[PDB]
Amino acid sequence: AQIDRLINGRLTSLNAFVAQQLVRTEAAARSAQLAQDKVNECVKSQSKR
Amino acid sequence: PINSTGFVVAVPTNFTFGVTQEYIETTIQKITVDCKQYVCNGFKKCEELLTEYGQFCSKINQALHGANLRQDESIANLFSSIKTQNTQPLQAGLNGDFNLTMLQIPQGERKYRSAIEDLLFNKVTIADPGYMQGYDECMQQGDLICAQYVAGYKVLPPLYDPYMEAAYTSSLLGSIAGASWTAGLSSFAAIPFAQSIFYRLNGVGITQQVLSENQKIIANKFNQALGAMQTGFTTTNLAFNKVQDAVNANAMALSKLAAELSNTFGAISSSISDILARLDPPEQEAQIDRLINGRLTSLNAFVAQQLVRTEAAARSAQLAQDKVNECVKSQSKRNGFCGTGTHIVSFAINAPNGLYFFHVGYQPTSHVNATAAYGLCNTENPPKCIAPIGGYFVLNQTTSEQQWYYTGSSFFHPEPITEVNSKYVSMDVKFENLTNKLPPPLLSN
Amino acid sequence: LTEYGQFCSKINQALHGANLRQDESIANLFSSIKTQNTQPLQAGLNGDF
Amino acid sequence: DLICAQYVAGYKVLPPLYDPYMEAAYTSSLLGSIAGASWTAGLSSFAAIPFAQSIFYRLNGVGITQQVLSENQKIIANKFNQALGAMQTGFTTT
Amino acid sequence: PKCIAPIGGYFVLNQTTSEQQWYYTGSSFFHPEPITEVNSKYVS
Amino acid sequence: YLLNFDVEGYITKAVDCGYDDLAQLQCSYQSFDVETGVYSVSSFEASP
Amino acid sequence: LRNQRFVYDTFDNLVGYHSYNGNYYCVRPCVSVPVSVIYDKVSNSHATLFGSVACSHVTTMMSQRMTKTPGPLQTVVGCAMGFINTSMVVDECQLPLGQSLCAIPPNPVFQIATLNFTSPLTLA
Ligand SMILES: *[C@@H]1O[C@H](CO)[C@@H](O[C@@H]2O[C@H](CO)[C@@H](O[C@@H]3O[C@H](CO[C@H]4O[C@H](CO)[C@@H](O)[C@H](O[C@H]5O[C@H](CO)[C@@H](O)[C@H](O)[C@@H]5O[C@H]5O[C@H](CO)[C@@H](O)[C@H](O)[C@@H]5O)[C@@H]4O)[C@@H](O)[C@H](O[C@H]4O[C@H](CO)[C@@H](O)[C@H](O)[C@@H]4O[C@@H]4O[C@H](CO)[C@@H](O)[C@H](O)[C@H]4NC(C)=O)[C@@H]3O)[C@H](O)[C@H]2NC(C)=O)[C@H](O)[C@H]1NC(C)=O
Ligand SMILES: *[C@@H]1O[C@H](CO)[C@@H](O[C@@H]2O[C@H](CO)[C@@H](O)[C@H](O)[C@H]2NC(C)=O)[C@H](O)[C@H]1NC(C)=O
Ligand SMILES: *[C@@H]1O[C@H](CO)[C@@H](O[C@@H]2O[C@H](CO)[C@@H](O)[C@H](O)[C@H]2NC(C)=O)[C@H](O)[C@H]1NC(C)=O
Ligand SMILES: *[C@@H]1O[C@H](CO)[C@@H](O[C@@H]2O[C@H](CO)[C@@H](O)[C@H](O)[C@H]2NC(C)=O)[C@H](O)[C@H]1NC(C)=O
Ligand SMILES: *[C@@H]1O[C@H](CO)[C@@H](O[C@@H]2O[C@H](CO)[C@@H](O)[C@H](O)[C@H]2NC(C)=O)[C@H](O)[C@H]1NC(C)=O
Ligand SMILES: *[C@@H]1O[C@H](CO)[C@@H](O[C@@H]2O[C@H](CO)[C@@H](O)[C@H](O)[C@H]2NC(C)=O)[C@H](O)[C@H]1NC(C)=O
Ligand SMILES: *[C@@H]1O[C@H](CO)[C@@H](O[C@@H]2O[C@H](CO)[C@@H](O)[C@H](O)[C@H]2NC(C)=O)[C@H](O)[C@H]1NC(C)=O
Ligand SMILES: *[C@@H]1O[C@H](CO)[C@@H](O)[C@H](O)[C@H]1NC(C)=O
C-alpha cells in the first residue's frame, strides 16, 4: 500500500510534466515562425512598416 | 562584384512555376462530457457518494460549454466574408489557355468537393462520428466513436455542413481575377482570369514584349505546375504531415479520455460492480471514493487541455484569415509570406480541421551574368541623367563607347531605352558619362 | 507497476511526438540556406563601414 | 547537478538537430544576403552591389537627397561605425 | 504608336448603360473627367 | 430540489429537478434564470 | 475459441460470450443516449434534441417524467422534439444546432431552418 502511494503520485506528476512540455513546444514553434518573418522583412530587405 | 564601373547582376533566362503547399488549422473537435455518467457509470451507490462533490461536476460541464461556444464564434467570424465578397463567374475547364479543372466543383445531387479536395481527403483516415444516427449503428455491434455512449462523452457536430464549406472555397476562387493598378478596394472589375495573370506577371518585372512572345509557353508551364499537385500528398511533404498530425491530436484526446476509466487509482478494481460484489461497508465506500477522486482530478486535467487547444485553434484561424486576404484575394509583395520565389497567385481548398493553400511562384531556372550601369548621363554643361524604372540598364552581351539597353528585372531581354522605361534623376558620380550613341531621353536636340 | 503498463508507454510516446515536431520546425527554418543567393563580403572595412 | 541527475532520476537531455557549425553557416548566409538592389519590382534577380553603395541607396529612399549624401559620406560612415561599436558593451540587466 | 494607361483609376465612357469619347475617373467614385497628363502615363 | 430563499429566510419557490429537461438545466446551473442557448444535460437513465 | 467461453479485449473487459445454446453474443456495457436542451429566455420555452438517435429508439425508450404536440422529427443531427419542419431559410440565428441547422424560437413550438449565405454582387 505504501509503495502504491508513490506509484500513483509519480505517475500523476509525470502526466503534468508532459502537458507542460507539449505547451512549451507549441509556443516555441510559433515563435520560430515569427523569427522567420523578422528575418525576411528586416534582414533580407528594408522595412517600410 | 566587379572592380569596374557599374555592377554585375544575374538576370533569369528561363523559368518555371513553383508550388509551395501550406496547411493552417482552424478548429478542433468539440467534446462534451456528462460528468456523473463518466465518474459513476450509472451505479446508484456511487452516485450517492458523488453528491458531496456536486459543485465540481457542474463546473466541468460549464467550462466545456464555454469553450465550444467560443470556437463557434471564431468559426462564424471566418466564414462571414461570403456575404461581403464580390465574385466573377469562371468558365468550366479552360480560362484562356489556363486549365482550372482540378480546382472547380464538377457539374442528381450536386457535389461539394473539387477533384483535388477529393484526392486530399481520400489519403486521410478519419473516423465517422455519426451525427445523424450513430447510436443505432453502434447498437448493431460487431471504437472511439462507439465509446461515446459507454464512457459518457459526446462529439458535437460542427457549425456548418460541407456544402457551406464548398460555398466558402467557391467564393475564394471567384475573387482572384481583377484589376492591379488601382489604389483603393471599392471597385470591382470583371477582368478574365488569363488577363489578370498576365497583369500580375508584368508587375514583377517581365516586360510586355516578352509576355506577348511567350503566351502559350507560359500557359503550358502553369498547367504543368497545377497538374502535379494531384500526385504530391505523401509522407515527405510537411503540410500533409501537419494535416495527419491535426487528425491524430483529435483522436488521442478521446483515447486518453477512455483509457483513464481503467485506472484503479490503488483500489482493488477499476470496476464498481466488482467492488460492490467483493467488499462490504465501510470498506466498500472507501474503495469507491478512491475512484471518485481519481476520475474527478483526471477530468480537470482534460478540461484544462481542451481550453488550451481551443485558444490555439482560434489564433490559427486568425492567421488563416490573414493568409486568405494577403495571398488569395491579392498578389503579395512580401518576401516569404506567400510561398517561395516571386508570388503570382494562390488557391485555397478545404482540408480536415482547416485550410490547405497552394502558393504559385515564379521560379527562375537559368541566369546570365549581365553588365549593368547605376545610371546614365550626358555631357551638357548642366548634365541630364536617367535611371531605369523597374529594371536595369545593361549591355547586350552574355559575357569606351558602349550601346546601353533596358531589360525587365525578371527576364533578360534587352530593349531600347525610352521615356517609358526611364526617369530623370539627380547627378551621381557613379553614373556612366556618355559621348556617343545617346538614348533619346538624353538628346539635347 | 505492471498493472499500470499502458500509462508509462503513453507518456513516452507523447514526449517522442513533441520532440519530433520540434525537429521538423527547426529544419524548416534552416532550409533557406539552400535557396539564398549570397555575395562575399570583405574582411574588416567595406568601403568605410 | 541537474546534468548529472539525468542518470539517477531516469531522464535524458537529447542533443539538438544541428551543431554550432551549421548555425554559423546560417548566420553567414544572412550576412551575405543584405547587399543588393532597391529599385526593382520582383525577387528573381540578384545584383552584386557592394555593401556601402547599398546603404547609400537605402538612405536615399527614406528622404535624404543625393547632394546631402555626397557631402556627408565620411560622417555617415563614422556615425554608423560608432553605433556598431557600442553593441559590444551593452548586454546587461537593464 | 503612342499609348497611354490610367493612373489610379479607369478610362471609361460617360454612360450608365465606332468612335467613342473616352474619359477618366477615380477608382472609388464615378465622376468622368477629361484625360490629361495628370491622370495618365505612357506605356508600351 | 432547487430551493430559493428570501432575505428573511423563507423558501419562496422551488424546482423539481427530475420533472423535465429544463428543470435539470436549472438545477445544474443552481439558478432559476438561465441564458438563451443550447445545452447538454444528463443522459437518459439506463438501469438493468 | 468457443471452448474458452469468454472473449475479452485489451483492457480485460468482457466483450463476448459463447452460450450453451450454440450462439455467440457480443457484450457491451450499458449505454445512455445524449440529450440537449434548446432554451429561449425571452419566451421562456424549450425543446429537446436527441443527437445521433433515430426517432424510433427514442419513441420506444420513453415508454421504459414529461418526456416519457408535433411528433418527433428526424434531422441530420438526430431526433428533435417540439419542432415543426419549416422550409425556412436564414442568414443568421441565435440557436445553432450544427450541420447548418438552427432553431427559430416562438415569437411570444420551435421552428427548424437552414443557414444559407449569398454573394453580394456577381458580375459577368
Ligand atoms: C441551404 O443550406 C442547406 C444546408 O447546407 C442545404 O441543404 C443541404 O443540401 C444538400 C444537397 O441537397 C443535402 O445533401 C444530401 O443529404 C442526403 C442526406 O444525408 C444524410 O443522410 C445520409 C445517409 O442517408 C448520411 O450519409 C449523411 O451524412 C454523411 O454525409 C454528410 C455530408 O453529406 C456528412 O456531413 C456526415 O458526417 C456524413 O458523413 C459520412 O458519410 C459520408 C458519405 O459516405 C462520408 O463522405 C463522410 O466522410 C462520413 O463518413 C447525412 O446524415 C444525402 O443522402 C445526399 O447524398 C447524395 O448527394 C451527395 C452529394 O452529391 C453524394 O455524395 C451522395 O453519394 C448522394 O448522391 C446521390 O444523390 C442523389 C440525389 O439524392 C441520389 O439520387 C443518388 O442515388 C445518390 N447516389 C450516390 C452516388 O450516392 C446529400 O448529401 C443536405 O442534406 C442538405 N442539408 C440539410 C437539408 O440540412 C440547402 O440545399 C441549401 N439551399 C440552397 C438553395 O443552396
Ligand atoms: C527552358 O527550360 C525548358 C526545360 O528544360 C527547356 O525545354 C526543353 O528544351 C529541350 C531542348 O533544349 C527539349 O529537348 C525539351 O523537350 C524541352 N522540354 C520541355 C519543352 O518541357 C526550354 O528549351 C528552355 N528554354 C530556353 C533555354 O530558352
Ligand atoms: C485539364 O486537366 C485535367 C486534369 O487535371 C484534364 O482532365 C483529365 O483528362 C484525362 C484525359 O482525358 C481523363 O482521363 C481524366 O479523367 C480527366 N480528369 C478530370 C476530368 O478530372 C482535362 O482534360 C484538361 N483539360 C484540357 C482541355 O486540357
Ligand atoms: C541582342 O543581341 C542578340 C544576339 O546576342 C541579338 O539577337 C539576334 O538578333 C537578330 C536580329 O533580330 C536575329 O536575326 C538573330 O537570330 C538573333 N540571335 C539570337 C541568338 O537570338 C538581338 O537582336 C540583340 N538585341 C538588340 C540589338 O536589341
Ligand atoms: C562622370 O564624369 C564626372 C565628371 O564630369 C565624374 O565626376 C568626378 O568623379 C570623381 C570620382 O570618380 C570625383 O572625385 C570628382 O569630384 C567628380 N567630379 C565632378 C565634377 O563631380 C564621374 O565620376 C564620372 N562617372 C563615371 C566615370 O562613372
Ligand atoms: C457626363 O454625362 C452627364 C450626363 O449623363 C453630364 O451631366 C450633365 O452635364 C450638364 C452640363 O454640366 C448639366 O447641365 C446636367 O445637369 C448634367 N446632368 C446630370 C444628370 O448631372 C456630364 O456633364 C458629362 N460629363 C462630361 C461630358 O464630362
Ligand atoms: C422540410 O420539408 C421539406 C419539404 O417541404 C424537406 O425537403 C425534401 O427532402 C427530401 C429528402 O431529402 C428531398 O428528396 C426533397 O427534394 C426535399 N424537398 C425540397 C423542396 O427541398 C426537408 O428535408 C424538410 N426538412 C427537415 C425534415 O428538416
Ligand atoms: C450590372 O451587371 C450585373 C450583371 O453582370 C447586373 O446584375 C447588375 O444589376 C448591373 N448593374 C447595373 C447598375 O445595371
TrEMBL record, chain F:
Signal sequence, start to end: none
Subcellular location: Virion membrane; Host endoplasmic reticulum-Golgi intermediate compartment membrane; Host cell membrane
PTM entry text: The cytoplasmic Cys-rich domain is palmitoylated. Spike glycoprotein is digested within host endosomes. Specific enzymatic cleavages in vivo yield mature proteins. The precursor is processed into S1 and S2 by host cell furin or another cellular protease to yield the mature S1 and S2 proteins. Additionally, a second cleavage leads to the release of a fusion peptide after viral attachment to host cell receptor.
Domain topic, free-text comment: Fusion peptide 1 (FP1) and fusion peptide 2 (FP2) function cooperatively and have a membrane-ordering effect on lipid headgroups and shallow hydrophobic regions of target bilayers. They are considered as two domains of an extended, bipartite FP. The membrane-ordering activity is calcium-dependent and also dependent on correct folding, which is maintained by an internal disulfide bond in FP2.
Function of the protein: Spike protein S1: attaches the virion to the cell membrane by interacting with host receptor, initiating the infection.
Family, per entry: Belongs to the betacoronaviruses spike protein family.
Quaternary context: Homotrimer; each monomer consists of a S1 and a S2 subunit. The resulting peplomers protrude from the virus surface as spikes.
Name the UniProt record assigns to this protein: Spike glycoprotein
Shown residues within the full chain: 332 to 379 of 1353
